Design a protein around this ligand. Sequence first.
Ligand SMILES: N[C@H](Cc1ccccc1)C(=O)N1CCC[C@H]1C(=O)NCc1ccc(Br)s1
Ligand SMILES: *[C@@H]1O[C@H](CO)[C@@H](O)[C@H](O)[C@H]1NC(C)=O
Ligand code: NA
Ligand code: NA
Lengths: 250, 27, 10
Amino acid sequence: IVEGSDAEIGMSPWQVMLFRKSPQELLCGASLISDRWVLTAAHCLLYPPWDKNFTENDLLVRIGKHSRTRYERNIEKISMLEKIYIHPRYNWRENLDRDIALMKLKKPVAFSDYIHPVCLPDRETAASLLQAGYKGRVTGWGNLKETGQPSVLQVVNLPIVERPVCKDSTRIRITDNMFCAGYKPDEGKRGDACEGDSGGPFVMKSPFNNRWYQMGIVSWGEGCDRDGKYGFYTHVFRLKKWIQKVIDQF
Amino acid sequence: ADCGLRPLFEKKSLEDKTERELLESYI
Amino acid sequence: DFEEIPEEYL
Ligand SMILES: N[C@H](Cc1ccccc1)C(=O)N1CCC[C@H]1C(=O)NCc1ccc(Br)s1
Ligand SMILES: *[C@@H]1O[C@H](CO)[C@@H](O)[C@H](O)[C@H]1NC(C)=O
Ligand code: NA
Ligand code: NA
């Protein structure tokens, strides 16, 4: 996260760290959506251009964390994966269209002050809140600048950007399964996700029922926090029929 | 059911330091 | 760079 701040304790209790077993290293962010299901970006698990194709046994999820590198005894909980599900039309060949994956845990995680699921949006909440200018919140342990790493979880609030501005900022083909967020060069304020924040959540607090909803997944960007560029996020509601099919069948 | 309500914030009616920035944008 | 996690998870 570029130009963010340290998270408060318990500020993002749905935050999940995707952790490689050997070598032990951070792979990605992710989010807790129930006691047994974790949401992330497909490219965190499968990206053939970089020879990335993880299996369940390669990976752990660490839930309840604040510190990036510490083992947070009596606070964090570490879970093994039962099964990975990648969207069948995830487009890793071109533009990361439908950049979404689910991970089912081997055993349910115990909720606590530090561990709690985020809501997924209904159609009405998505329609009301996914508007240009409305701000969401992105969290992660990724790079603090494009070209080190944070001591603790980072947080930045960013406005959703008009779709023509998103399209005109890049040569990559945008789709309806994406939205972009960030400040414009004139707006003064800054901030973005960066490498290592992949798969983490873009959340919004509904003013109707005061619950946090996950509207997006950190997907891609060209650099980090560049003027005239914007971060791109998987449009969670657009893919919710696939989410519900996986969870209902598995 | 309980989703999206944080034990250390919404469940105790405490606000975090920047959530107001989000609310103010929802015009 | 990371603190070793308990062996039971590995
Ligand atoms: N720089 C490329 C641009 C691109 C290439 C191919 C298809 C789509 C987009 C890119 O973003 N990625 C390459 C694959 C993974 C993804 C990534 O690094 N994601 C993480 C973030 C980086 C910055 C922000 Br903000 S989020
Ligand atoms: C990823 O790996 C799995 C198992 O190793 C394999 O079945 C699958 O075909 C691979 N996918 C791609 C796109 O290479
Ligand atoms: Na363009
Ligand atoms: Na920018």
